[PDB]
Write an enzyme that holds these catalytic residues in place. Structure first.
Site, mmCIF file in Angstrom:
data_model
loop_
_atom_site.group_PDB
_atom_site.id
_atom_site.type_symbol
_atom_site.label_atom_id
_atom_site.label_comp_id
_atom_site.label_asym_id
_atom_site.label_seq_id
_atom_site.Cartn_x
_atom_site.Cartn_y
_atom_site.Cartn_z
ATOM 1 N N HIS A 97 29.954 33.106 62.278
ATOM 2 C CA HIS A 97 28.541 33.034 61.903
ATOM 3 C C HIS A 97 27.839 34.329 61.506
ATOM 4 C CE1 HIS A 97 28.103 28.793 63.316
ATOM 5 N NE2 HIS A 97 29.054 29.154 64.156
ATOM 6 N N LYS B 138 11.378 33.067 61.881
ATOM 7 C CA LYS B 138 12.773 33.191 62.301
ATOM 8 C C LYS B 138 12.810 34.300 63.359
ATOM 9 C CE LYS B 138 14.049 34.662 58.084
ATOM 10 N NZ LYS B 138 14.276 33.272 57.603
ATOM 11 N N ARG B 139 13.936 34.480 64.036
ATOM 12 C CA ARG B 139 13.993 35.535 65.039
ATOM 13 C C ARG B 139 13.661 36.867 64.362
ATOM 14 N NH1 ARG B 139 16.374 34.564 70.132
ATOM 15 N NH2 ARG B 139 15.966 36.795 70.423
ATOM 16 N N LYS C 187 16.510 40.682 58.801
ATOM 17 C CA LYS C 187 15.705 39.591 58.253
ATOM 18 C C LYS C 187 14.557 40.187 57.451
ATOM 19 C CE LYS C 187 16.984 36.127 61.459
ATOM 20 N NZ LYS C 187 18.036 35.093 61.224
ATOM 21 N N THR D 173 19.257 28.474 57.850
ATOM 22 C CA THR D 173 19.065 27.028 57.842
ATOM 23 C C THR D 173 17.582 26.737 57.707
ATOM 24 O OG1 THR D 173 19.358 27.246 60.252
ATOM 25 C CG2 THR D 173 21.137 26.153 59.019
ATOM 26 N N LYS E 21 15.235 23.940 55.629
ATOM 27 C CA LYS E 21 14.138 23.161 56.183
ATOM 28 C C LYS E 21 12.900 23.195 55.283
ATOM 29 C CE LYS E 21 15.872 24.551 60.562
ATOM 30 N NZ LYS E 21 15.369 25.272 61.699
HETATM 31 C C1 PLP Z 1 16.058 26.377 62.049
HETATM 32 C C2 PLP Z 1 15.564 27.343 63.151
HETATM 33 C C3 PLP Z 1 16.024 28.665 63.228
HETATM 34 C C4 PLP Z 1 16.856 29.332 62.089
HETATM 35 O O1 PLP Z 1 15.986 30.093 61.196
HETATM 36 P P1 PLP Z 1 16.584 31.020 60.036
HETATM 37 O O2 PLP Z 1 15.470 31.234 59.107
HETATM 38 O O3 PLP Z 1 17.877 30.460 59.540
HETATM 39 O O4 PLP Z 1 16.909 32.380 60.839
HETATM 40 C C5 PLP Z 1 15.543 29.488 64.197
HETATM 41 N N1 PLP Z 1 14.605 29.054 65.064
HETATM 42 C C6 PLP Z 1 14.161 27.772 65.013
HETATM 43 C C7 PLP Z 1 13.236 27.327 66.088
HETATM 44 C C8 PLP Z 1 14.629 26.903 64.062
HETATM 45 O O5 PLP Z 1 14.148 25.594 64.003
HETATM 46 C C1 NBG Z 2 25.814 34.936 64.923
HETATM 47 C C2 NBG Z 2 24.666 33.974 64.487
HETATM 48 O O1 NBG Z 2 23.814 33.585 65.295
HETATM 49 N N1 NBG Z 2 24.676 33.606 63.209
HETATM 50 C C3 NBG Z 2 23.696 32.731 62.671
HETATM 51 O O2 NBG Z 2 24.225 31.367 62.641
HETATM 52 C C4 NBG Z 2 23.429 30.460 61.887
HETATM 53 C C5 NBG Z 2 24.111 29.130 61.902
HETATM 54 O O3 NBG Z 2 25.357 29.299 61.265
HETATM 55 C C6 NBG Z 2 23.297 31.000 60.421
HETATM 56 O O4 NBG Z 2 22.559 30.138 59.611
HETATM 57 C C7 NBG Z 2 22.607 32.361 60.446
HETATM 58 O O5 NBG Z 2 22.500 32.861 59.123
HETATM 59 C C8 NBG Z 2 23.407 33.351 61.310
HETATM 60 O O6 NBG Z 2 22.679 34.538 61.489
#
Ligand code: PLP
Ligand code: NBG
Ligand code: IMP
Ligand code: IMP
Ligand code: PLP
Ligand code: NBG
Lengths: 830, 830
Positions: A365, A556-557, A562, A664, A668
């Protein structure tokens, strides 16, 4: 009301009395003292009742038919609330809405009471949850296996602009969905030593911790299939954890039980970062050891625990079992499977290895080095002695394979070793997973290619057949039907309902791209969603926003990769331009940035403080008015995501090319009517490729450009020197324009940006704001903005986790998905 | 089948489907995988269903009518199993027996699966449980308040003849009777400091621990009254227990929550022994602080939280509230009530004191010094600073009362002080309770007199009106109807059923003392009981006994004052006499000794080893044959007591005169058809007085003789010198006759017996064996033995806890008991 199912006469009546049964008999309350929380539980129990029947027959079914079983091992399962999702998958939403209405209650108000199941950090944890939903929907005999932490991801609090962490006691009021199964408790060993006697090695003098399972139901979408998510809890044995005698104190001995039980107490709040703590390693072996015993027990019964060739022949193990490794966290499953087969079942090494490789599959990942698991040998040495011996033996045999393939390539040998020499010896868990799995996959096309070209190049040259790709996806149920019923309804009005479990059908929406009514509707739901979010904001967090502005959100985190910082630079620029020409018109924007920072990530927490600092200035400047607002979305989590995403206009996916494996959240936003501004990174590439680059806002360096720059050497000063607007911002930060009382507050951010930016923020600045100007231009043309939106929505089908799972199923697990309704839920009591 | 109620047609059918509902919906199992444990829970849930309706109306009732409330504070509640007891009190036993039979299951087999609620050590804890049952049966608005320990009294294991302690994880599989009430969680403070500002003192900078309540239903006997037992659990706040920032570790902070939660983790396993540990003190304040907030909240509502004089006038507090202190454990309730009234409600000292004294009552349970609570001041000083200040002020005012009453009596002043000077200053909790309560009572007539004459003499001279007596009792429901249905049935055949809630009616059995059929029946049930126990023994513990022999049993906690050692001396004597004249006839006996020793009580554990040591020799001597067996009953607890007592012939209540406050086990044996051999101690006196000394086997020193001996000085050597049989035994112990491999194993016991016997075992030896010869003589005459039994049973009525409670009610609480059936359980949903 919508297609949340039928509000049948008989069933609404039935629901109501059961609601009352539970309120009385289960909650032991009377209408006169019942609070909204009580009502939520009465409903929750009523709904849970409807899937136990299906849960029992599904599990009995798999026992009778005995198909190949899929085991998804992950240390994270970011589930979120489960009430509504269960109603949706069981076609109970309208009936429950009606019934609760007749009981004089607002279902929506009750749904807000359910605590989130935050047993995950972000993307990796959520992927696991979407996968579980898809595997159930595709009728796979699949089981999610993890740890039942009593404290999930911390709840984020912003105090004085800083993040404050506080324990997430999600079990405080109980969890009506789980079913404790103390009768299936298993023992897990730690420490001890290895005895080599006559016929085999023996793991001896170990400390025992018990693993108690908790089952949670996972309902497929309207097919009567209810799979199981089994979460393990740590429990101390009552013997030795008291019985190892000769003074210490009886009381102390009982109080010390909370030392073995600390294993499942809290989730590590790290996202894409490796922390080599012993507690983590214990959690990793704990979930692996317990799960495997469960897997083998089920196998021993199957149809072999009756007859078949008769002789526990594990040759059919891979034909009946498939275990998927979600990252390297459950990597010990490989040496543990070997330990059991060799040490306990007494298979010869080679036969055992053949079986192990054939049943295990690994999913990678991330490519950033700091996220890679490399466990110090002294730790494995002390905690899992026999496993270390097995790992060394695996390494020995593997390297011999390499040497035989590339004779004389001595550097290749050290590079591929599972054992890393240096300061302290370490074990590269990723190398272990590749060697012991028959398939290794990336989570997006470019990420998969990068693995083959870079990180695992040598491994790819050795066994090219192992490497695959499986682009991530999200579940259309929770991420469309559940969080955005308005949009799902208008879509269903034109193309039907079959798309919920066949998202590809969204393409049919392309032919309405010029439909006047549709354009008006798509635009209407988004306006309603923005209005509902703007309200929630003042309701629960308090201090107004403007629903007519462009909703610019990045959730996102918090990470340096990012680039929330890049987003920050743009926001300040907008501000500075407005302050330069106040009476010039600009498209109004509400930029919302939200996400959690790991507790020990100093930079990430500094960035959160910057965001709030910018808002303090921007949000209180009279000249700016309602043209620009900067808001930090507090405690971003699944349930909050279900609220912002449907209300977003602009989705920010701006990581440095080559750093975001897939992502992901981007998906969304695409399925919910938001346009995407981003870099050619992760799944962004496949999204733009699917909607057409003309309907996407791509900017910045591609992976190649990043590498070119690295050869050359990245010098941020250059950018600082040639861009006045950029220079102006940096000097604003440096002088305290954004931190009056503490003028040097942001020296770390500036220092980093100028001297150690690993993610070259400055390098993408110019193209980023230029590109942002283009989206503002298009927003000024409502009709064309909406038409481009329709182009994204209609083309997001490929990003459903049903597609991803179907691929894993066929190309890795060797099973065939099926959309066949299980034979009703119907009573039955044999 | 018996008078376990009616096995109605409609209700047996109803029971069966609900049993099935739960097995499916609640346990989520199907008949094909259900185990006996699953069946037990299905039944338990089905039974629990029947009293929630009554539970809700009882509590609603007390809210409407608003009578005076009784609060029984105790750190112990020895409940035992609750399934059968609930069936009995709800008249459900036969219906459930029928229904489960039709479902193809043995109810008795399922009842054995229920874990005991061992939240108590012995007599004090069990008294509380019998009291709760009686208070419900007498229709009192009473509440039991305690601590929900997750680990109750340890489970005893005998390894190599030694006791081994192991954690009692009674919650492992869950508790179907309790109802968690997280919505009523309250905060409890610790540490901090006191600030004296303008208008009052302030308890500040305290550490907060949350108290989460769990309610368990307490059904009265067939009257539809279901009272509540509220048990508190410790929980850490999620803020400060994480939020007190500035480095330490986020993970560590979450793991450290199990430091505040350790308060309710385990019960202190001490019986009649005081251990001054900080954890204990914390448990004591915890239950007191949380309970009081609950009491005042309920009071604030009452009918004052509507109107009345209007002005929170606490003058009516004592008219609405009554709190009973079970020993000094909850003694902090006095200064805490003052703290709240003075510090928070702002009442003047004197008005607050008047209220406090008028609502509090203290019950004393022992006179031995080592059992008396004397807390070091430095501890109270650190942990509860304001309470220490209040205690000093109470002491100040009290002593001034004494000085004014006894002018110039300077020694009396230091003797009565709540503060004890010396090595370390201590606070005499007993003195605190006397001063702050309007009633102090003993638990047996002689014990009460001893308090007045000895221990609390000065206090009695000061306020003679405070001192009372309330002879203990036991509940005829669990201790007759539940454990001995056979005996209850034959009794009911002659005099009806009204005696179950009116035990005095047992006297009518006196007129059947010459009835030939009755004598035969009474003798028959006892033979059946002995046969069933003899079987259980081989079933669960394994190694035969003879059901024709006299069942000589002594079951209670192991203590030096209970004199299991004296029992031991007799057993060895019997053995030695048999070995002297092998072919002489002697009445066969099975002497069963059982009980738990506190983990740190070295002597007590040594005694357990002696008992098993004697059995090793006696049970394997061929010459002895089946004439004498020595068996140590393992893990004696409530559920085991329900099995041995009904099967006993001889009950041993041989403590040193003046040491056993009352005792309750003695009463249990008397009502179940066993004859009593004992000393004039505790309730033994009132029992012999009730049955007539001719129908009792009394021996040994009276209290007066003990004192005479102490004046003189007790010299064990004298007895050793004048009694050859006694000498022979001591030399047998000293030379290793009972411990071959370790000849000096019992040197501590011998040394103690000869030089520091605080309970003069030798002094009662001669009269004890002489007396034992008399019971053996009478056993040889079955008809006369049974007739004497009938004399005891028919005369035990006075020892029902209904009588005890009725007295507490009228003479202390100021409430009138009522045997009025609450208006049915009938549905209802307002
Ligand atoms: C989908 C989701 C993530 C993933 O976000 P990315 O933009 O791919 O880093 C993280 N936190 C929550 C609560 C989500 O629903
Ligand atoms: C190590 C880790 O948490 N990787 C994370 O996994 C999600 C689900 O695959 C990816 O969408 C994301 O880009 C990536 O940063
Ligand atoms: O020995 C068996 N006989 C009949 N059904 C079984 C048996 N073992 C498992 N099952 C069924 O299969 C389900 C699966 O159990 P599992 O082993 O936890 O996967 C159970 O709840 C039963 O319905
Ligand atoms: O404000 C109120 N209105 C109506 N009934 C109440 C109210 N407060 C308590 N009750 C009833 O009294 C029971 C007692 O609650 P308690 O306060 O825990 O003793 C509740 O379950 C209700 O039936
Ligand atoms: C009644 C009871 C007690 C009290 O026994 P005494 O002989 O009064 O010391 C102790 N333990 C259990 C389990 C009891 O049932
Ligand atoms: C301090 C203590 O536990 N005392 C015990 O209390 C029970 C119940 O009152 C008495 O029967 C018993 O004799 C006495 O030893």
């Amino acid at each position: 009301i919508s297609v949340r199912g039928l509000a049948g006469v008989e069933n609404v009546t039935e629901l109501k009395k059961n609601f009352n049964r539970h309120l009385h008999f289960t909650l032991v309350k009377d209408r006169n003292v019942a609070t909204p929380r009580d009502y939520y539980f009465a409903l929750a129990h009523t709904v849970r009742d409807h899937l136990v029947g299906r849960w029992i027959r599904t599990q009995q079914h798999y026992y009778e038919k005995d198909p190949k079983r899929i085991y998804y091992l992950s240390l994270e399962f970011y589930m979120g609330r489960t009430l509504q999702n269960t109603m949706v998958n069981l076609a109970l939403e309208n009936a429950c809405d009606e019934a609760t209405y007749q009981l004089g209650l607002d279902m929506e108000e009750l749904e807000e009471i359910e605590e989130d199941a935050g047993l995950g950090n972000g993307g990796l944890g959520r992927l696991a949850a979407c996968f579980l939903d898809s595997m159930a929907t595709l009728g796979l005999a699949a089981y999610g296996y993890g740890i039942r932490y009593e404290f999930g991801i911390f709840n984020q609090k912003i105090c004085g602009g800083w993040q404050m962490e506080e324990a997430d006691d999600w079990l405080r009021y109980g969890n009506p969905w789980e079913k404790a199964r103390p009768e299936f408790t298993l023992p897990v060993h730690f420490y001890g030593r290895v005895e080599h006697t006559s016929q085999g090695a023996k793991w001896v003098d170990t400390q025992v911790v018990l693993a108690m399972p908790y089952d949670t139901p996972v309902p497929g979408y309207r097919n009567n299939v209810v799979n199981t998510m089994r979460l393990w809890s740590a429990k101390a044995p009552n013997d030795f954890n008291l019985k190892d005698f000769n003074v210490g104190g009886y009381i102390q001995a009982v109080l010390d039980r909370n030392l073995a039980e600390n294993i499942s107490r809290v989730l590590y709040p790290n996202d894409n970062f490796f922390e080599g703590k012993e507690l983590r390693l214990k959690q990793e072996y704990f979930v692996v050891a317990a799960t495997l015993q469960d897997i083998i027990r089920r196998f021993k019964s199957s149809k072999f625990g009756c007859r078949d060739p008769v002789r526990t022949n594990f040759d059919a193990f891979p034909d009946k079992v498939a275990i998927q490794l979600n990252d390297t966290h459950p990597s010990l499953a490989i040496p543990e499977l070997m330990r059991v087969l060799v040490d306990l079942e007494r298979l010869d090494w080679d036969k055992a290895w053949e079986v192990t490789v054939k049943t295990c599959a690994y999913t990678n990942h991330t490519v950033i080095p700091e996220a890679l698991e490399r466990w110090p040998v002294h730790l494995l040495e002390t905690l899992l002695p026999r496993h270390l011996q097995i790992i060394y033996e695996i390494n020995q045999r593997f390297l011999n394979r390499v040497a035989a393939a590339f004779p004389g390539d001595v550097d290749r040998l050290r590079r591929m070793s599972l054992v890393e020499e240096g300061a302290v010896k370490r074990i590269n868990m990723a190398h272990l997973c590749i060697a012991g799995s028959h398939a290794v996959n990336g989570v997006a096309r470019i990420h998969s290619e990068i693995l083959k070209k870079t990180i695992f190049k040598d491994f790819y040259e050795l066994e090219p057949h192992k490497f695959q790709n499986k682009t991530n996806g999200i579940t259309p149920r929770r991420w469309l039907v559940l969080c955005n019923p308005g949009l799902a309804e208008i879509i269903a009005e034109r193309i039907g309902e079959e798309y919920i479990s066949d998202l590809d059908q969204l393409r049919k929406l392309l032919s309405y791209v010029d439909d006047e009514a549709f354009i008006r509707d798509v635009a209407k739901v988004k306006q309603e969603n923005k209005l509902k979010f703007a309200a929630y904001l003042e309701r629960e967090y308090k201090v107004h926003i403007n629903p007519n502005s462009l909703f610019d959100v990045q959730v996102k985190r918090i990470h340096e990769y990012k680039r929330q910082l890049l987003n920050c630079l743009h926001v300040i620029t907008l501000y500075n331009r407005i302050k330069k020409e106040p009476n010039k018109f600009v498209v109004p924007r509400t930029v919302m940035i939200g996400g959690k920072a790991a507790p020990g990530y100093h930079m990430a927490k500094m960035i959160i403080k910057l965001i709030t600092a910018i808002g303090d200035v921007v949000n209180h400047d009279p000249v700016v008015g309602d043209r620009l607002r900067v808001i930090f979305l507090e405690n971003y989590r699944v349930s909050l995501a279900e609220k912002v995403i449907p209300a977003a206009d602009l989705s920010e996916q701006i990581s440095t090319a080559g750093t975001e494996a897939s992502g992901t959240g981007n998906m969304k936003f695409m399925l919910n009517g938001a346009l995407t501004i981003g870099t050619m990174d992760g799944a962004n590439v496949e999204m733009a490729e699917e909607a057409g680059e003309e309907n996407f806002f791509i900017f910045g360096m591609r992976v190649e450009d990043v590498d070119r720059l690295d050869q050359r050497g990245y010098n941020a000063q250059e950018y600082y020197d040639r861009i006045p607007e950029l220079r102006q911002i940096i000097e604003q930060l440096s002088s305290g324009f954004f931190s009056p009382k503490q003028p040097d507050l942001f020296k770390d951010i500036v220092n980093m940006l100028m001297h150690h930016d690993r993610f070259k923020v400055f390098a993408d600045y110019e193209e980023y704001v230029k590109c942002q100007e283009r989206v503002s231009a298009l927003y000024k043309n409502p009709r064309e903005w909406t038409r481009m939106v329709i182009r994204n929505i209609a083309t997001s089908g490929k990003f459903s986790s049903d597609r991803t799972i179907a691929q894993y199923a066929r190309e890795i697990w060797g099973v065939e998905p099926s959309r066949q309704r299980l034979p009703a839920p119907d009573e039955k009591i044999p």
